[PDB]
RNA sequence: AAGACGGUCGAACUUGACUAUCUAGAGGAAGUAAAAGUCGUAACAAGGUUUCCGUAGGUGAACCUGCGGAAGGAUCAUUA
RNA sequence: CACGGGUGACGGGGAAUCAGGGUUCGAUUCCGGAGAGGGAGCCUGAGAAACGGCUACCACAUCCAAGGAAGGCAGCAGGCGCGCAAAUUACCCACUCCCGACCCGGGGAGGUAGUGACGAAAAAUAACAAUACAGGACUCUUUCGAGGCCCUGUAAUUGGAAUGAGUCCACUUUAAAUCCUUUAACGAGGAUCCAUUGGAGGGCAAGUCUGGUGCCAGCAGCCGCGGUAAUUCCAGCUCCAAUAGCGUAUAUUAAAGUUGCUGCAGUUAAAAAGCUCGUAGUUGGAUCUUGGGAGCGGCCGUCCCCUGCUCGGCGCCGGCCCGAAGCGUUUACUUUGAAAAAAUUAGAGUGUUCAAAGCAGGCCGCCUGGAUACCGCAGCUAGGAAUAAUGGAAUAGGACCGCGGUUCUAUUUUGUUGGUUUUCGGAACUGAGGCCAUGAUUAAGAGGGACGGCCGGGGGCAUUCGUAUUGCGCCGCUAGAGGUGAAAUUCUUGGACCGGCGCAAGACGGACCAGAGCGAAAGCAUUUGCCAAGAAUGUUUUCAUUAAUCAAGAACGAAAGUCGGAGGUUCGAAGACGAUCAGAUACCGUCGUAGUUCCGACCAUAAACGAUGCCGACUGGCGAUGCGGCGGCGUUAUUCCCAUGACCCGCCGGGCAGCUUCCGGGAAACCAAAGUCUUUGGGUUCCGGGGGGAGUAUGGUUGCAAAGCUGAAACUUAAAGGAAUUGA
RNA sequence: UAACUUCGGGAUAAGGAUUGGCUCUAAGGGCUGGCAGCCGACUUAGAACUGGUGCGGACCAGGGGAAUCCGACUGUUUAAU
């Protein structure tokens, strides 16, 4: 059955970006998905999106640019200290100039570079570049 | 897919976005639930109380006209059946299969389905014991299940 | 990995143990069956007494008589076949004397054209066999 | 002080039982490896009876046959 | 994952290897445990179940006058033994400490030397000049040849200079010595004061040199060399590698993404259980606090606020501001703090002559060092509140807000003694209230259940029909009929085969029948009836997470086979005979037993196959087909038009497949999945680790048996194998 | 308490210990009006002491184990070899 909605959302975006489409429909919606794309939004990887409100788990239509190479999810959500963060980004990012690890902290869902900027560990969610 | 079948069916009811009440419906909440009351005394599970209300009386969803749902109305009054209806209909079916299987021992398919049906009884029974609508010692006995229909 | 839960460390760990026993090199080092089958008992060298001097045929493509010696170990009494390595060195080995034997190169596996020998002679009568070949030392009489 | 009844801890010996390793054995039956051995030709082509799986019987030996499968077949097809 | 067993198991601080992860080792100097040949029992003592204390027994062993006595090196040396495998029966309490009545005595603790290629650091075996030459940039020069201002190398050519290896006066060192350091005198020409260990076919740096051997001797980790021109053996010459070191054997680490958490594989190379159910285990849909303002800066970036209910101090006028104490869903997570032995590792300083080290040192008495980081997990502490768990009020037995009492009861209170009730307080029990916006998220392209019309060789029971086959009865006419490649066995004037009419028996269900359907799979096909079940579709019905995959366990599981009965037409293991053949215990032919059929019980295996786990999401088209539903021109029935049937044109949802494709993947064949994988993480189960031995031995368990399930090792071997290509 | 097994047996398998006398203790029930009174009958377990180690003191009262052959077994048979 469906087990991790964020895993389905990012796999769906990655297939449609890989085939060159312009919009994607994300079938289930949640606060974690909406908060994850707003992180990808702030760095210019995707365009602006829109969540459709049926009285159930809503849908999302996301405008795509041509800038996304891969978005992914890490399962399970491991916990990561500030000591482990350099090793995680050594494994699953292309280079040291671009690419981001999104990881939820008590301060909120937010990517790795500035998660280090306010000195908080967290739980790893995924990556994009 | 189905729990005890390989089919993957998608047919289901689709509830409309507007959860208001239509203007052409004139029944108010109080006389709808007395309409529900007298249908319970005719002898009817909540499943078909709501069926004969949305095709002859026009109430699309009882939970939209009132604030409550049908089975919640009944036990708030005292007319709820003793054991839940979905568990009741499994026991009723497993009794029929068990009786038919008893008269001809060579019905292997009947024996296979009876395993499946009595499996669904136990899966559902321990759910109702976690939500505490059955006593914690309630058990399904194949011999005595005939008495309670 | 196939199972990827946070609370599946017992599953993953206890599956390594089972599947490590199908590794051939792991299987023999961590069982006592291989160690007790070793004539040396797990040592690198062993000394024994010469029983007789024998020569074996080599193998299908080759054709030569491999000069060997049948030696009986001291710590066990087990009888093995060792190979007097170099050219003509078999003369220096006589019956009823003490020799030092070592493995022949491949950890208990047969090597080259000699069929079924795991051992080699390095010293006879407490004087190095390579020194006798080079003429640097002579047999202690 | 020696010594003595009793109690307690209890070595040790005798016997028995269980258990682990190692080892002898007439004869029997395998496996591997050498080889210009004897008898056939079973598998490779439609390998000259297409091959293979399961099961049962039989035969110097490879094998043969009966029943039900498979194509990894030698047919992706055969006409109102 | 108890209990039992094994450990070539004393635990730890640590060691080796290492990208990131890990793997292996820790007898070994520091901490902790245990033991003194094996057990057991005690005395003294603060402290012992002590053994350089005692008493027994067992083993071993010493002296003896034969009566008795004595013993415990896993302390320092040393010896035997075992072994592949490990040092002197040396000097001293001078240093470090410890013991005693003690400044004074003692210490095989410990220190110092001897052996010491375990291993680690430094570092000689030549340097330079001149001639002869050879090259190079230069010039002249057509080159050649020559000028050397400029080199660069080489040459058992010549030449003077510089040293330490060594011998050794002394000093220093030291408890006394030794070593190092300092320093006199000797001490280098083939500076013989002489560098080795492995290789030269490939991997892998480096001779097709010469002599010998002739598949012999030998070499070779692997591939392989060697049979009269050996680049590989044995030698000489030359060359290569490392260099006071190098080779070989063994354990182990990396290489090994060949144990895969990071991170492998399961169509055909080794591999997914026959099928479903199923408990532990693992994993689980959405859903509840946004936002606003102060301040600074270039719409933008940083600082701040959005829990309350006894004691004092910014104090002011019983109230207000703050500080302190107690109280307040629980965790996981994250950041901080404390607490964490040194030694080792990382690391700061410092010219041990550098370095490995060491904790020292520097300046003309003074000045300073002896840092710091890391130390998982578990326990403690303080902030954060995203993510993930978890609880509240639904027979209200719920919050609050005060009033009505009962009981027990702290204690204030009647100037000082005494008895009672108050009130004031505390705790518990009990009435009537008001008040809350009074209290139940939604209704998953999750699931369960209900309901409606259908659908299907799905299942069981009974029933019915059909020819055909074999046999039998009668009738007709006849000499052959059957079989094969050809024949024979076989039947035949006692009438076979053939034609006709009947009867009986047991099987079987053609053609229709399809890359159609139903079922969990195995499987399911004459008619009719009965009984129970099911998918999909339709649904503005109901419950509201009840779910997914699943060790152990359970139901079904073709054919064959086993056991009881009944029946036995055909076919037909075994067997028999006739052929063929070199043989023919076969293929071909005739006969034919068990079986093939049914009922009731076992067995649990198949190429039980799609050689392809299940659940979920996403990613191209096109024409079909089956079921259900929806809509539309028009034909055709009923007829009497509505509506249902049969065609036709589309749309939707499940299903069996098909064609095409640079989606993408793959070693490829090929696959719309076998894709969404080095851009590697959706959940979960089973399962492979070169080929054999071998699904074998043994043990256990199931079965009447046949056999099923679980399941090694010794030993052997450089390949076995998959897809495709060219030949034959 | 073994091999084996037709899972019923083998089996009292095999092999060990105890046993007297005396003096006590505890447990095991009725009837009448979680209590009280009045009645009882035999057993089992445990303890102390004690005897020239003696105790199922007479009587009664299975020797056992490992294999082979035959007949499955219970049963019957040549009154007088
Ligand atoms: Mg399931
Ligand atoms: Mg052949
Ligand atoms: Mg043939
Ligand atoms: Mg053939
Ligand atoms: Mg074939
Ligand atoms: Mg045969
Ligand atoms: Mg030990
Ligand atoms: Mg240790
Ligand atoms: Mg001790
Ligand atoms: Mg000793
Ligand atoms: Mg002692
Ligand atoms: Mg001693
Ligand atoms: Mg001592
Ligand atoms: Mg040594
Ligand atoms: Mg001293
Ligand atoms: Mg002194
Ligand atoms: Mg010492
Ligand atoms: Mg020298
Ligand atoms: Mg050579
Ligand atoms: Mg080489
Ligand atoms: Mg080379
Ligand atoms: Mg070589
Ligand atoms: Mg390794
Ligand atoms: Mg690696
Ligand atoms: Mg592999
Ligand atoms: Mg395979
Ligand atoms: Mg399968
Ligand atoms: Mg969730
Ligand atoms: Mg430390
Ligand atoms: Mg038909
Ligand atoms: Mg199972
Ligand atoms: Mg069958
Ligand atoms: Mg049968
Ligand atoms: Mg039968
Ligand atoms: Mg014949
Ligand atoms: Mg026949
Ligand atoms: Mg199988
Ligand atoms: Mg398979
Ligand atoms: Mg992967
Ligand atoms: Mg293997
Ligand atoms: Mg070879
Ligand atoms: Mg194969
Ligand atoms: Mg017996
Ligand atoms: Mg016999
Ligand atoms: Mg008898
Ligand atoms: Mg008689």
From Swiss-Prot, chain A:
Component of the small ribosomal subunit. Part of the small subunit (SSU) processome, first precursor of the small eukaryotic ribosomal subunit. During the assembly of the SSU processome in the nucleolus, many ribosome biogenesis factors, an RNA chaperone and ribosomal proteins associate with the nascent pre-rRNA and work in concert to generate RNA folding, modifications, rearrangements and cleavage as well as targeted degradation of pre-ribosomal RNA by the RNA exosome. Required for proper erythropoiesis. Component of the 40S ribosomal subunit. Part of the small subunit (SSU) processome, composed of more than 70 proteins and the RNA chaperone small nucleolar RNA (snoRNA) U3. One of its GO terms (molecular function) is structural constituent of ribosome. The modification N6-succinyllysine is found at residue 87. Keywords: Cytoplasm, Nucleus, Ribonucleoprotein, Ribosomal protein. GO terms for biological process: translation. Belongs to the universal ribosomal protein uS8 family. HAMAP family: Ribosomal_uS8_A. This is Small ribosomal subunit protein uS8. PROSITE patterns: RIBOSOMAL_S8 (PS00053). InterPro entries: Ribosomal_uS8, Ribosomal_uS8_CS, Ribosomal_uS8_sf. It comes from Oryctolagus cuniculus. The gene is RPS15A. GO terms for cellular component: cytosolic ribosome; nucleolus; ribonucleoprotein complex.
Swiss-Prot record, chain B:
PROSITE patterns: RIBOSOMAL_S15 (PS00362). It is found in: Cytoplasm; Nucleus, Nucleolus. The keyword Ribonucleoprotein applies. One of its GO terms (biological process) is translation. The modification Phosphotyrosine is found at residue 37. GO terms for molecular function: small ribosomal subunit rRNA binding; structural constituent of ribosome. The modification N6-succinyllysine is found at residues 26, 33. It comes from the Eukaryota. Ubiquitinated at Lys-26 by RNF14 and RNF25 in response to ribosome collisions (ribosome stalling). Keywords: Acetylation, Cytoplasm, Isopeptide bond, Nucleus, Phosphoprotein, Ribonucleoprotein, Ribosomal protein, Ubl conjugation. GO terms for cellular component: cytosolic ribosome; cytosolic small ribosomal subunit; nucleolus. InterPro entries: Ribosomal_uS15, Ribosomal_uS15_arc_euk, Ribosomal_uS15_N, uS15_NS1_RNA-bd_sf. SMART domains: Ribosomal_S13_N, Ribosomal_S15. CDD domains: Ribosomal_S15p_S13e (cd00353). Component of the small ribosomal subunit. The ribosome is a large ribonucleoprotein complex responsible for the synthesis of proteins in the cell. Part of the small subunit (SSU) processome, first precursor of the small eukaryotic ribosomal subunit. During the assembly of the SSU processome in the nucleolus, many ribosome biogenesis factors, an RNA chaperone and ribosomal proteins associate with the nascent pre-rRNA and work in concert to generate RNA folding, modifications, rearrangements and cleavage as well as targeted degradation of pre-ribosomal RNA by the RNA exosome. This is Small ribosomal subunit protein uS15. It comes from Oryctolagus cuniculus (Rabbit). The gene is RPS13.
Curated annotation (Swiss-Prot), chain C:
GO terms for biological process: translation. There is a cross-link at residue 36 (Glycyl lysine isopeptide (Lys-Gly) (interchain with G-Cter in SUMO2)). SUPFAM superfamilies: Nucleic acid-binding proteins (SSF50249). Its main location: cytoplasm. Hydroxylation at Pro-61 affects translation termination efficiency. Pfam families: Ribosom_S12_S23 (PF00164). The modification 3-hydroxyproline is found at residue 61. The modification N6-succinyllysine is found at residue 53. Keywords: Acetylation, Cytoplasm, Endoplasmic reticulum, Hydroxylation, Isopeptide bond, Nucleus, Ribonucleoprotein, Ribosomal protein, Ubl conjugation. It comes from the Eukaryota. Residues 1-25 are annotated as: Disordered. Residues 1-19 have a biased composition (Basic residues). GO terms for molecular function: structural constituent of ribosome. GO terms for cellular component: cytosolic ribosome; nucleolus; rough endoplasmic reticulum; small ribosomal subunit. It is found in: Cytoplasm, Cytosol; Cytoplasm; Rough endoplasmic reticulum; Nucleus, Nucleolus. The modification N6-acetyllysine is found at residue 134. Component of the ribosome, a large ribonucleoprotein complex responsible for the synthesis of proteins in the cell. The small ribosomal subunit (SSU) binds messenger RNAs (mRNAs) and translates the encoded message by selecting cognate aminoacyl-transfer RNA (tRNA) molecules. The large subunit (LSU) contains the ribosomal catalytic site termed the peptidyl transferase center (PTC), which catalyzes the formation of peptide bonds, thereby polymerizing the amino acids delivered by tRNAs into a polypeptide chain. Component of the 40S small ribosomal subunit. Part of the small subunit (SSU) processome, composed of more than 70 proteins and the RNA chaperone small nucleolar RNA (snoRNA) U3. Belongs to the universal ribosomal protein uS12 family. This is Small ribosomal subunit protein uS12.
